[PDB]
Design a protein around this ligand. Structure first.
Ligand code: SF4
Ligand code: SF4
Ligand code: FES
Ligand SMILES: [Fe+3]
Ligand SMILES: [Fe+3]
Ligand SMILES: [Mg+2]
Ligand SMILES: [Mg+2]
Ligand SMILES: [Mg+2]
Lengths: 625, 625
């Protein structure tokens, strides 16, 4: 089918799209086609539902009617409020994610989380001392853990003037944030204030609204996401470079296949541990299987890739197609980006769809709730359900379409600094010498509006050929991986200078830095380079890009990158084009305020030119050629 | 004129609607007409904009097309998520309001709030002892205040299992909330979790979404709103019964008229203090004015009414018309329900439109930001701006249309118990005897869809006639006041049992209990009666109603009343009718979850019948003969 080829660049997607057609299974692409054309007002953002004096739409009519909402709000306020709440939903997703890590570490500290431990005691002591815990280096690890928990919880309270991790940002940046009123003070507080501001008759100034959206996104990047990342490393180990594989071919016909989907490693690590217990493995063999095979989806797949090397079956738009292989015996979900269609598709097979979080409820799913005190017991129970489902798999409907592609993962900042010999000097020398011209974090999702991974891959290829090193997170990981970009030998794909540096360090030209919360690592690394050099983040030769974004979380990531000084490309526009003032603030006005702005460009080669031009401009202001 | 009489029941509204039409001033009614018909999908709730795989619309078709969103979400999920975020917006308004009160009491305890003090030390010592402050009766007041501030701030953190004021609810109700997973744990936390739940691919079950909507609302009523109410009494005095007046005729031609609009008394109490300084009054006398006249709008007006007896100019739909009088020399606004059209109407006169809050920014307004450390100095500056605006008032454009009408205000729970002799027994005895059959809180807004105050007033009259005492708060206060029902002589309008009780106590049949946050006084009073009788709130002959609601805050108030066991009538439907399952849950399902449910009924006599019927059934539950 020509339509099927138009939907993805990957062979495995085409194979499963053909299989779904022959079986009568509708996909995300079919539903997108039904939802086209979209409502013009919703698309432009010129519609409001925030009270029942409405709902309102802002139109351009020759009689001048419908220029304002019933309360008097114009298109600038309505668009800005809609964008503000959109960002707040993304920040809330990462807020709750980090809060779960705090609760988990606290349970470990009190000895009430069987099977969870402090995997990286050294990092616990370093992070705790950094945040002010007295005698963190010498006191018993659990006492230090309880004092660190208290610090992170205070960031989720209402008495701080600035988040604890904000100290990593250079002083010039903290001074500018304070001057603009952008300093994030509380992870939950900024979210709550955004919902108050967007109520009828509170914040009715588009500038002020976008300013607080930046403060809310900063409370994510330097708060919710950074806490989640750093505590995840403490509980489950700091990532280190390791080999693994990617694509639908990671599923095995001869094994029980358990797909982990969602976001939080507190569940996926414990599922993986369950499948490794000898009695559970023996139950799989009693059922006729050779082994139990865990395969990751989306960000929780990234978490297992980074710390355990678990192969990843696919990213966002592969999630339905992974069930269409007919070889998934269970999908285990927690929260965020889990399309509810997956429940219906799993019902077309033997596959069990298991929910684990009180926040991630799906009508028709099997719910086995996981908490720190019962995780070890419950995850054992979930794996036993997958083995039971395996015995009823229909072999006639199994089609695992491809051979897996080799990848390298595990590039935390600790691993990067280890590869460099303990200091960022060799990396700074490479940038000053022009071998590495700059860095671009390529982040974010897939979106049915764009042929899947076409922009992700093209942009990655363009940047490394221009001696720009790519830091990959989120669903871009799978795209870079399937394109053969995540291995040390991929230096052959990069420009002469980047390839030389990569070969001298033994690293790939695209560094997998983890999940979407792990974009906080990109913030930490920028802050480190800026502080070492004595400049602002907005002076560094850096950029960020989400060529195929879809979610509120991706928009919050883009906003905190911009607000931290990182020019940020988006493949598609947010629903803001109904207000030229808001659009001009996002694309230009922010540049004059925070030192960076949004870019919207659907052509990935054009996007490469723009990100490169920003990097060239910033190199010149550092005195570099 | 027929159209004009159709828009309000009041003479002062009629006069300003004529003046507004003659002057070409666009009102909330004119814009509501332009926005009719509304978008069918928006009004039904079957539209989603939570990610850019969409936006999506759900149609009902036999062919099954557009039955699901791009992510596969159906109408139940889309409607429930929309209503969840709607509720969260209202809870957030009360959250930030209560938070501002904590910060003010802290500044007083620190000695860093010139012009503020602990007005009610006895209540501070009583609230602090109640919440667990050690030696609250003897330790220095500022030490006790600091320990209370710590407790309230902890309820804005992420470490509690249940909010501090939740201990007021009866044990049976606390046990049900705990089993349902509905117990409010953190004011900001429940708001953030709702925004997480409503992100794509998180909570995709309408029952679970509605249960957290209840938890989020309960974090308002027993958290943000109850903290706001109790600290306001501590900082500004516990209200006690007093007389005052209402309507546009409270503005005086010979005086500088300052309208306080918005919500937080932290601003309006200091505006009033400023108008009493001898030097400032001399400046007004220099300008030709005989006095400085402060008058209240909406909830901040309710606050000044309850504690200082300051006359009230109007409620929500009177706000624009108050400027149309041509005698408003300044509007002093903070946040919530402040229609931005007021800025344009102010621009049509001499009136200064002054914003005071970093959250309540309005393009084109004069911003004089107020915080505890500078309120005394800044509020003086604001009054001077009003005096200067007075000098430019055009006498020929002034039309103050009515003479003010007498009311009685200040019925805090402390005031009610004092009137009863110290204990609630005389009220309990009157209910047992059937002199008072029950109590209904009539709360909430005006809405252009309903002839202003018509349903508010008709419901109030119907209920007292049936021996049901009415507790009024919010913008219903102005309606009851202008109807002449807020005075002890209104006993002649009540049934025989209610009139005898009111005359023996010397109180009106309609008790003004304060602002929207003071709906927490109604929760406190229901909890007291239930604990005294040893029953649940869902056993009490109580009810709640908002016949003309508009705002997210009102929907949140209705939800926390429903979730606390109080049957709640709404005059208009939330945007949920696109899902029969969500609608059936709101109107029927919740009875079997929380012991109460919503009602939607635009006929206020019908609404009285339904509220009365619930009261009859609850009297039977208590064995009353
Ligand atoms: S807040 Fe204003 S623009 Fe939005 S729905 Fe209500 S009246 Fe319309
Ligand atoms: S969350 Fe689902 S229903 Fe809502 S806009 Fe995105 S794809 Fe459409
Ligand atoms: S669906 Fe109502 S405006 Fe888009
Ligand atoms: Fe992601
Ligand atoms: Fe109100
Ligand atoms: Mg715990
Ligand atoms: Mg500021
Ligand atoms: Mg203070």
């Amino acid at each position: 089918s020509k339509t099927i080829r138009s939907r993805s660049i990957w062979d495995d997607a085409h194979a499963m799209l053909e299989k779904a057609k022959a079986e009568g299974i509708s996909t995300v692409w079919d539903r997108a086609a039904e939802q086209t054309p979209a409502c013009k007002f919703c698309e432009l953002g010129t519609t409001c539902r925030n009270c029942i004096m409405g709902p309102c739409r802002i139109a351009n009519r020759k009689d001048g009617k419908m220029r304002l909402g019933v309360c008097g709000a114009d298109a600038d306020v309505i668009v800005a409020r809609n964008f503000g709440r959109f960002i707040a939903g993304g920040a809330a997703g990462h807020s709750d994610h980090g809060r779960d890590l705090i609760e988990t570490l606290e349970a470990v500290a009190e000895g009430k989380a069987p099977g969870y431990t402090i995997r990286d005691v050294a990092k616990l002591r370093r992070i705790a001392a950094e945040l002010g815990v007295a005698d963190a280096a010498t006191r018993p690890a659990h006492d230090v853990a309880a004092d660190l928990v208290t610090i992170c919880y205070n960031d989720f309270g209402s008495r701080r003037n600035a988040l604890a991790f904000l100290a990593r940002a250079p002083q010039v940046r903290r001074d500018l944030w304070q001057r603009l009123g952008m300093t994030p003070r509380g992870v939950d507080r900024e979210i709550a204030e955004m919902m108050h501001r967007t109520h009828m008759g509170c914040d009715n100034d588009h500038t002020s609204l976008l300013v607080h959206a930046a403060r809310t996104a900063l409370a994510d990047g330097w708060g919710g996401s950074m806490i989640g990342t750093e505590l995840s490393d403490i509980l489950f180990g700091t990532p280190r470079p390791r080999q693994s594989t990617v694509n639908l071919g990671v599923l095995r016909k001869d094994a029980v296949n358990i797909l982990v989907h969602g976001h939080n490693p507190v569940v996926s690590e414990m599922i993986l541990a369950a499948t490794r217990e000898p009695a559970v493995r023996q139950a799989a063999q009693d059922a006729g299987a050779a082994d139990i095979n865990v395969a990751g989806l989306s960000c929780t797949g990234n978490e297992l890739l980074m710390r355990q090397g678990i192969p990843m079956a696919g990213n966002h738009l592969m999630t339905e197609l992974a069930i269409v292989t007919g070889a998934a015996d269970a999908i285990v979900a927690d929260y965020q980006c889990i399309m509810p269609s997956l429940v219906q598709i799993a019902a077309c097979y033997h596959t069990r769809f298991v929910t684990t979080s009180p926040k991630g409820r799906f009508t028709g799913a099997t719910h086995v709730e996981v908490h720190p005190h019962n995780a070890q017991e419950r995850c054992r129970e979930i794996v036993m359900l997958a083995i039971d489902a395996y015995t009823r798999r229909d072999p006639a409907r199994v089609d695992i379409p491809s051979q897996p592609v080799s990848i390298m993962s595990g590039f935390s900042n600790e691993a990067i600094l280890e590869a460099l010999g303990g200091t960022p000097k060799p990396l700074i020398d490479a940038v000053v010498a022009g071998q590495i011209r700059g860095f671009v974090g390529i982040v974010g999702c897939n979106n049915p509006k764009i042929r899947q991974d076409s922009a992700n891959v093209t942009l990655t290829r363009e940047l490394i050929r221009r001696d720009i090193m790519v830091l990959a997170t989120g669903c871009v990981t799978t795209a870079a991986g399937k394109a053969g970009l995540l291995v040390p030998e991929a230096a052959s794909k990069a420009g002469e200078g980047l390839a030389a540096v990569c070969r001298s360090l033994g690293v790939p030209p695209v560094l997998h830095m983890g999940s979407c919360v792990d974009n906080s690592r990109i913030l930490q690394l920028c802050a480190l380079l800026a502080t070492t050099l004595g400049v602002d983040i907005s002076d560094l030769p850096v950029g960020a890009s989400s060529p195929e974004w879809y979610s509120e979380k991706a928009a919050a990531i883009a906003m905190y990158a911009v607000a931290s000084g990182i020019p940020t490309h988006l493949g598609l526009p947010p629903n803001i084009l109904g207000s030229e003032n808001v659009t001009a603030m996002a694309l230009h006005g922010l540049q004059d305020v925070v030192g960076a702005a949004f870019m919207v460009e659907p052509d990935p080669v054009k996007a490469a030119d723009m990100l490169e031009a920003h990097i060239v401009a910033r190199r010149a202001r550092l005195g570099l050629t």
